[PDB]
């Protein structure tokens, strides 16, 4: 009783709010898809992570996610923040409705209330206090750019996109086809992986990028194969699918056409190996190069097919011949992975 | 030429000398002298609390010196400060790096630290007047992930890392006061002294080292283990410590005897020990296993006193309240279980 009765109620309320925000967190989290990017060496695995109709809608998403938080947290703070302009009243109410709705169209009406709000001295007063409550990193940037985002012809500049970025220097969460991804780059770790590799058992896919031209050098290709087999056989990683990027296509082609360094030296079983029957060589590609390429691919495949369990799959690819875009490949491969997750779950596979 | 040969020869001999010097002190076994002592008997605990605030797998937790509140970190990027009694949420701190391999609670309960694959130790002030808990100071000197860490006080803080080294920092200055090196693998865990004079650590070299906070050098190296040492905990009096390992056996090492006194294992346990800790008296030795269970051993007789049924996934972390009134275990199922 006494004051204690009130204190219990206090901790009760605080816990309530925390519960709320957490409820908001579970949705976005479960909506996200975590990926683990790794490679042995000289694979430029930092480049893939280094590298526009949706981007606009994303920017707008951020802007709204900002304004809503600002106007919402005004009265929730200890000294609830008053607007200097009461005439913006119904404009706040509006923002207090639209928040947390799926596939919002952001009508021309919205930008008026939002901009006019960002004009309100009380709202800004609320933002200057943002350090105490939780707000998205990029707010003032996009909140100052509202009028610019208004335009139907709006075409975000490179510099304007750089702020749309989520995170640790290695950590990346990027948006593709309206599907959240959160990648992690392990290049900031030493070469003993057994302890930290356990960190992702929940990762939807492990992006494994190995140089196809490394078969010579030390035979780093065999090392990559080893690392792969180990990843594939680990008890904690048994359920994780590996999206495989075979890099340095051009370099492989060069080495192969040259002839000095022969795969069969480091992979004798290649001499008895013929290019796959379904092989679809690209224009201007010597059948020898195609054969070697497919031999490596199959070298990584035989391990994935060794288990025979079907809990996970390995999706091979060829890249770095030319940069282009592997994000879409990754996307589709993830879609397949999850589709087979549900499929296998139902014994439909 | 042939200098390195002489060096390795002297090193081998030294190893032999230490081996024998230890073999000499070995006149008895802790098992021998505890033989007559009445056992703990089979006695099991129960779950008084189940704390669910976590979206993802919990990688670690810590008890507040107040014996009430407790800190827990999860792969979901959230750091939750709970209240064991009321099972409420005192705090929720969003991390920058979603992958967090450890956290610690300051002795004053004022600050809370975390760390992980980000290679950085984030200190958060809980006493902030202006508002909620925001990052107070983040310390990155590390070339590898942060496995473990502990507060000496509200100023300086010790951490261990996959970088192969342990380091004592100074939060205010933001730099490293001292650096401990010489582990041959990732340093998975550490344990301070009651007096914070010195601290041990387990690592992936299958050996635990005992360091000194002032000197910055390793005084003693204990090796009983076959595989990596996942967790390490001090004995209440400070003269010994326990270690879990992937060899699936916990080991007790005495400092003054400079050797392993006893091994806690079972023919039915092939899985490594993720975490360990003692009870108030130090009679019980608790260890979490990959098996999802939690084994309660007898730090003297070597027999398992009991077990904790529990989480449907591997138990990541384990702790015992400073007043030894309760036990807490985090797992990969996002749930914390408090036991009595």
């Amino acid at each position, epitope marked *: 009783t006494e004051d204690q009765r009130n204190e219990e109620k206090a901790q009760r309320e605080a816990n309530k709010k925390i519960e709320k925000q957490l409820q908001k967190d579970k949705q976005v989290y479960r909506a996200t898809h975590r990926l683990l990017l790794l490679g042995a060496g000289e694979s430029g695995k930092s480049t893939i992570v280094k590298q526009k109709a949706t981007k606009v809608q994303d920017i707008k998403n951020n802007l709204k996610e900002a304004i809503e938080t600002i106007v919402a947290a005004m009265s929730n703070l200890v000294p609830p923040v008053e607007l200097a302009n009461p005439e913006n009243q119904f404009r706040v109410d509006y923002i207090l409705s639209v928040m947390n709705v799926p596939d919002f169209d952001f009508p021309p009406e919205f930008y008026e209330h939002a901009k006019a709000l960002w004009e309100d001295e009380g709202v800004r007063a609320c933002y200057e206090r943002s350090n105490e409550y939780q707000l998205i990193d990029c707010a003032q940037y996009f909140l100052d750019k509202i009028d610019v985002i208004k335009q139907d012809d709006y075409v975000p500049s490179d510099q304007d996109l750089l702020r749309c970025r989520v995170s640790g220097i290695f950590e990346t969460k990027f948006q593709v086809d309206k599907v959240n991804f959160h990648m992690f780059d392990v290049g900031g770790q*030493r*070469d*003993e*992986r*057994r302890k930290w*590799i356990q960190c992702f058992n929940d990762v939807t896919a492990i992006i494994f990028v190995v140089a196809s031209s490394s078969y010579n*050098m*030390t*035979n780093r290709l*065999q*090392e990559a194969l*080893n690392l792969f*087999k*180990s*990843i*594939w*056989n*680990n*008890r904690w990683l048994r359920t994780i699918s590996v999206i495989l990027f075979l890099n340095k296509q051009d370099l492989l082609a060069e080495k192969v056409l040259a002839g000095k360094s022969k795969i069969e*030296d*480091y*992979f*004798p*079983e290649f001499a008895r190996y013929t290019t796959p029957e379904d092989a679809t060589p690209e224009p201007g590609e010597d059948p020898r190069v195609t054969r070697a390429k497919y031999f490596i691919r199959d070298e990584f495949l035989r391990i994935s097919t060794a288990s025979g369990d079907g809990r996970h799959y390995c999706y091979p690819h060829f890249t770095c011949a030319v940069d282009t875009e592997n994000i879409r490949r990754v996307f589709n491969d993830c879609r397949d992975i999850i589709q087979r997750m549900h499929l296998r779950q139902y014994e439909l596979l | 030429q042939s200098e390195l040969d002489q060096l*390795r020869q002297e090193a081998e001999q030294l190893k032999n000398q230490i081996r024998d010097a230890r073999k000499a002190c070995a006149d008895a076994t802790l098992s021998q002298i505890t033989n007559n002592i009445d056992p703990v008997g089979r006695i099991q605990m129960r779950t008084r609390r189940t704390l669910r605030g976590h979206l993802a797998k919990i990688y670690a937790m810590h008890w507040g010196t107040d014996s009430r509140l407790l800190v827990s970190a999860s792969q979901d990027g959230k750091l939750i400060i709970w209240d064991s009694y009321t099972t409420n949420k005192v705090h929720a701190i969003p991390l920058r790096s979603s992958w967090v391999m450890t956290c610690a609670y300051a002795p004053s309960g004022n600050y809370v630290a975390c760390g992980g694959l980000d290679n950085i130790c984030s200190i958060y002030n809980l006493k902030t007047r202006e508002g909620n808990v925001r990052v107070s100071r983040e310390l990155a000197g590390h070339t590898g992930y942060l496995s473990c860490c502990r507060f000496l006080d509200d100023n300086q803080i010790v951490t261990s890392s996959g970088d*192969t080294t342990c380091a004592l920092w100074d939060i205010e200055t933001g730099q490293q006061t001292t650096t401990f090196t010489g582990h*041959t*693998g990732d340093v998975m865990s550490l344990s301070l002294a009651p007096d914070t004079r010195l601290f041990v650590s387990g690592a*992936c*070299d*299958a*050996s635990a080292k005992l360091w000194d906070v002032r000197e910055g050098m390793c005084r003693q190296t204990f*090796t*009983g*283990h*076959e*595989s*990596d040492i996942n967790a390490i905990c001090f004995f209440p009096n400070g003269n010994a410590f326990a270690t879990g390992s*992937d*060899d*699936a056996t916990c080991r007790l090492f005495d400092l003054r005897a400079d050797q392993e006194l006893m091994t806690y294992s079972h023919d039915n346990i*092939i899985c*490594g020990i993720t975490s360990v800790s003692f009870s108030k008296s130090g009679r019980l030795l608790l260890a979490g296993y990959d098996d999802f269970n939690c084994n309660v051993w007898d730090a003297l007789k070597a027999d398992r006193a009991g077990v904790l049924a529990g989480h449907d996934n591997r138990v990541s972390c384990l702790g015992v309240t400073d007043d030894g009134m309760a036990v807490a275990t985090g797992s990969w199922d996002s749930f914390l279980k408090i036991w009595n």
Partner: nanobody
Amino acid sequence: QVQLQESGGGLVQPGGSLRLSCAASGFTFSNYKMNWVRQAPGKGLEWVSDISQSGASISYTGSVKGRFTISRDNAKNTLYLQMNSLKPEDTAVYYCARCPAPFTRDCFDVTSTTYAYRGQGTQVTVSS
């Protein structure tokens, strides 16, 4: 403790043969997957041949294929690599290193230096 001492090895004329032996101790040899790792002159370590606890699953590097046969004695806690038809390219330091975890398939050794369970190794040289 845990230690692996590579013995044998030495100078051999090209085409010849050399049999590497490894004494293991400080752990139960039966539960660990074993392997041989070599380091060529001034170059990073490279995996050579592995053998499963059971003595069943056995792998060799592409090159050593048919020229190298790895055999383990469990009861005697020892590892064996029979090297035949040695070539001048085989000259390197052979360490016998065991997987970190007991009762397993995978391995995360063959780290450049900085690996807990690996021998100091032996020097195998092929004369020209």
